[PDB]
Design a protein that fits this description.
This is part of a larger assembly, with two copies of chain A and one copy of chain B. By secondary structure, chain A is mainly beta. Helix content of chain A is 10%, strand content 39%. Chain A has helices at residues 239-245, 398-401, 404-437, and strands at residues 2-8, 12-19, 27-48, 59-62, 74-81, 87-88, 91-92, 100-108, 119-137, 140-147, 160-163, 176-180, 183-185, 203-204, 214-215, 220-221, 233-234, 260-262, 267-269, 275-281, 296-304, 315-322, 326-332, 338-339, 343-346, 349-357, 365-369, 374-376, 387-388. In chain A, the strands form eight sheets. In chain A, strands 2, 3, 9, 10, 12, 13, 18 and 19 form an eight-stranded antiparallel sheet that branches. Chain A has a four-stranded antiparallel sheet with strand order 21-22-26-24, with no helix packed on it. In chain A, strand 2 and strand 3 (27-48) form a beta hairpin. In chain B, helix 1 (45-55) crosses helix 2. The chains are: A mainly beta, B mainly alpha. The complex binds 2-acetamido-2-deoxy-beta-D-glucopyranose (5 copies). One 2-acetamido-2-deoxy-beta-D-glucopyranose binds at residues 139, 327 of chain C. One 2-acetamido-2-deoxy-beta-D-glucopyranose is lined by residues 139, 327 of chain C. The PDB classes it as virus like particle. The entry lists the keywords western equine encephalitis virus, receptor binding, vldlr, virus like particle.
Chain lengths: 438, 102, 438
């Protein structure tokens, strides 16, 4: 039986319904979203960390001159000085008075500790929601891992579940993200080959062990004005460290809809944002005929101590007489009040108690037991506990959040205004027939 | 996000959607606010007014504004219609002074 | 110098233009799209082929029972038959007359030759166009391989090129494609897990060597009613063979815009659909100042034997009286006429000849030599050859494809109509003058 409904994307909060095929008994069906998985498609751009700015030994040729060719080393910087006179331990280093050429040499590489303290720049795209579904029907359970794209079935064979496209696309990640040590940030990093000195992404490479390392850290080799051999250098501060200053806070503490970010496939887990249309093809083996199901001769619900809150606050007891002892689906036919129990055991006569959670000040709703329809009416008190540690099972509605007493007051005032309108037009029509007489 | 030293209390607003607070290295704690406004939705009208004012302020202001506008327009238009009909009944008899009214 | 223009996507067919700086000589520049590569991002759903439908050896138990548990093998089907009495070459096979049982087992695996004859189901997305360009500017040549997205730059020595987003996105691949032996088909295959027996996708797996194979072939095990030990089974035919029946024609012989489909990254090559806006950072060393540019005192063209075909039909001779001998760009400023030669050798006073191709029946276009402008007009006959082995270098325009004598006739009739309307308004003004006079 193909049954189509809409479940919320909230983890937990079982969504209960009846599938009512005509010739067969009503069958319970609840779907629970155990987990959710926003996994965007990520493209790796580069890896950055703190650079090492290694400076090789100064190369001097005296009574001579030097020039360097271009090198593939990251942030290559040569400079030639023609008036040096180096003084290591033991006097002058060579044999010419004034004309002496020194090659100041500078380039950057990855630090030895970048195998851990590194940041990966990623570009993401649209994310696909994968939801784990606990679906129970009759006395049978099923655990599925479905995709919300709207065409891919679940991974359980026998129960075919199509999870339709979700109403709103969330995508907590911006188009560019940065991953460092399990923490994810929405940072607009520079593109590959588009570095800026002093900012994030001074040094870039496709891997830690890659030799194609690029950088444009602003290093300037100053003229050696001291006796001793030296390569004076002025360099920009590490932009990875400067980003560690002003990284802000990660998406584990910033992301909307209260869902947590993980980094091994970079997924957003348990985002409760939208509504998932769902269609289930329940096999005919689950359905039993109406003959084998017990039938209810008489049912009446009396509800005591109802309270509209997140918890199942309120106890309605069904007093029932039925011919055959057996098991019976029980359901609430209102989108505002949901029952805790889906099935009960019915004897020849007696009463069963049931717990429900509602979001309306009035408990007027239809409860079904082995089919059937009974109507329950009560005034539900506001909660005394201000804040609860579990979420609301149901959503508020405008027609239900307004109580029956308030509805009577507003309709009495509006009907009074309308009655004055009607009597005004009636006396105007009487004046019209009087001026027709005149 | 706040770095806290000493014994100082912080107030946080919790809605129906919820609020998650992490304090130190402890696991996140999630809370949800219930609609527990002062008053009584099943009682005298004023208690309903305070209840739905603390729950949804702008909504109850516009609802009572609509009720006040509706009753004012209804009474004013009904009074105008009765006055017009009373004039339409009187002025046939007002133009004839010696006529005897029924 | 950032120069922005628009190039057709037709492979070959050079598009020529002049970069005319104020203080420098005119510079020729032509773009040729040597090759294009329209590669979509492919997501692999599953692989499929024929199935072997292997049947294990029957397991019998006499004076016993055999219940069989579930198996992870693809399309597992197990049946228990409790009245068997099997025979082999040797007679009766067990020791109980009627209380026997047989476990008929049948599952589905890949055929041995699926390493070649297999179909990969792919879900493609929007396709990024990568174009290879032969640019020439001044007297130098360069080659480019740049994207069309309009953000990343194509770099070649001292050339930075931004190829803007193309006018129309084509994407010849549908959302679902199937690749078999280098042939691509636009087929709406069932999703992963949505197996339908007797259809393409009876058997599905992530890879050919994967052990997580799924299958829903309509296989049924019958009750053995023969003396021989036998598993009577009946199965639906392979949907791979059925799709080989009704594969239709592949996308290599069906895709629009005349471009070749290749399979190893699944790209489309040489697709000529939409105009590409392009911006070029011309190096300043290519230009020369107007002092070194030989100007002409008087240019004068004349066309002879013009013909509007796809080939370079029709020749025109410039007679010129320049002040210097050198090399000079020549250009046709209309979008209907295009010249074969972008350079010529200029002397003191002489006549050069050039070949042009047009699409208009008139030869009205402005030709330029070392700057300068001249317009020479004559009559172009229609071609005699009905087809030709080369594409047209230009595109028809409504303002040009209508012949000059036909503009003369249409404008003569329209001007006659407008002249009679003017006469009517004139005599209406005269009537107004008379009724003011009375
Ligand atoms: C489901 O199984 C339970 C096991 O106790 C049984 O009581 C119940 O009747 C079954 N449901 C149906 C609809 O047969
Ligand atoms: C690093 O970052 C912190 C965090 O804002 C900032 O206050 C500080 O000035 C920065 N520098 C140092 C040296 O700590
Ligand atoms: C926090 O809320 C309480 C609740 O009554 C209020 O009395 C108190 O003034 C608030 N404190 C601050 C600092 O806002
Ligand atoms: C451009 O280079 C070619 C290559 O030989 C040469 O023939 C031509 O004269 C050059 N053009 C100019 C304007 O010097
Ligand atoms: C296979 O495909 C062809 C092509 O349409 C079809 O005509 C034919 O009937 C099919 N079957 C066989 C057995 O050839």
């Amino acid at each position: 039986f193909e049954h189509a409904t809409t479940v919320p994307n909230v983890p937990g909060i079982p969504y209960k319904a009846l599938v009512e095929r005509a010739g067969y008994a009503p069958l319970n069906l609840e779907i629970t979203v155990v987990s959710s998985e926003l996994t965007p498609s990520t493209n790796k751009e580069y890896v950055t960390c703190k650079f090492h700015t290694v400076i090789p030994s100064p190369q001097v040729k005296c009574c001579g001159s030097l020039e360097c060719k271009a090198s593939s080393k990251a942030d290559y910087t040569c400079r030639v000085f023609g008036g040096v006179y180096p003084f290591m331990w033991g006097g002058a280093q060579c044999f010419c008075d004034s004309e002496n050429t020194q090659l100041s040499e500078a380039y950057v590489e990855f630090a030895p500790d970048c195998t851990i303290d590194h940041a990966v720049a990623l570009k993401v795209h649209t994310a696909a929601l994968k939801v784990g579904l606990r679906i129970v029907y009759g006395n049978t359970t099923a655990h599925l891992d479905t995709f919300v794209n709207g065409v891919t079935p679940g991974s359980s064979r026998d129960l075919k579940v199509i999870a339709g496209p979700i109403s709103a696309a969330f995508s907590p990640f911006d188009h560019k993200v940065v991953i460092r040590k399990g923490l994810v940030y929405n940072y607009d990093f520079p593109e590959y080959g588009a570095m800026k000195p002093g900012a994030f992404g001074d040094i870039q490479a496709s891997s830690l062990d890659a030799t194609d390392i690029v950088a444009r850290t602003d290093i300037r080799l100053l003229k050696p004005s001291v006796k001793n051999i030296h390569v004076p250098y002025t360099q920009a501060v590490s932009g990875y460290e400067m980003w560690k200053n002003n990284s802000g806070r990660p998406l584990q503490e910033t992301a909307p809809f209260g869902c947590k970010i993980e980094v091994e496939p970079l997924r957003a887990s348990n985002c409760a944002y939208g509504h998932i249309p769902i269609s289930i093809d329940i096999p005919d083996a689950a359905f039993v005929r109406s003959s084998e199901s017990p039938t209810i001769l008489e049912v009446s619900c009396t509800v005591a101590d109802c309270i509209y809150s997140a918890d199942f606050g309120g106890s309605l007891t069904l007093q029932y007489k039925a011919d055959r002892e057996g098991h019976c689906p029980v359901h609430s036919h209102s989108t505002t009040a949901v029952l805790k129990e889906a099935t009960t055991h019915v004897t020849a006569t007696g009463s069963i108690t049931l717990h429900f959670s509602t979001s309306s000040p009035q408990a007027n709703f239809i409860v079904s037991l082995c089919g059937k329809k009974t109507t329950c009416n009560a005034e539900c008190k506001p909660p005394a506990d201000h804040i609860i540690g579990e979420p609301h099972k149901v959503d508020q509605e405008f027609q239900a959040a307004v109580s029956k007493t308030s509805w009577n007051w507003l309709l009495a005032l509006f009907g009074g205004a309308s009655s004055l309108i009607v009597v005004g037009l009636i006396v105007l029509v009487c004046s019209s027939m009087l001026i027709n007489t005149r | 996000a706040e770095w806290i030293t000493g014994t100082t209390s912080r107030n946080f607003s919790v809605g129906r959607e919820g609020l998650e607070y992490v304090w130190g290295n402890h696991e996140p704690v999630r809370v949800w606010a219930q609609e527990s406004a002062p008053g009584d939705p099943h009682g005298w009208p004023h208690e309903i007014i305070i209840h739905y004012y603390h729950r949804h302020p702008v909504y109850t202001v516009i609802v009572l504004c609509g009720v006040a506008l509706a009753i004012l327009v209804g009474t004013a238009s009904s009074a105008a219609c009765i006055a017009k009909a009373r004039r339409d009944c009187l002025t046939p008899y007002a133009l004839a002074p010696n006529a005897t009214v029924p």
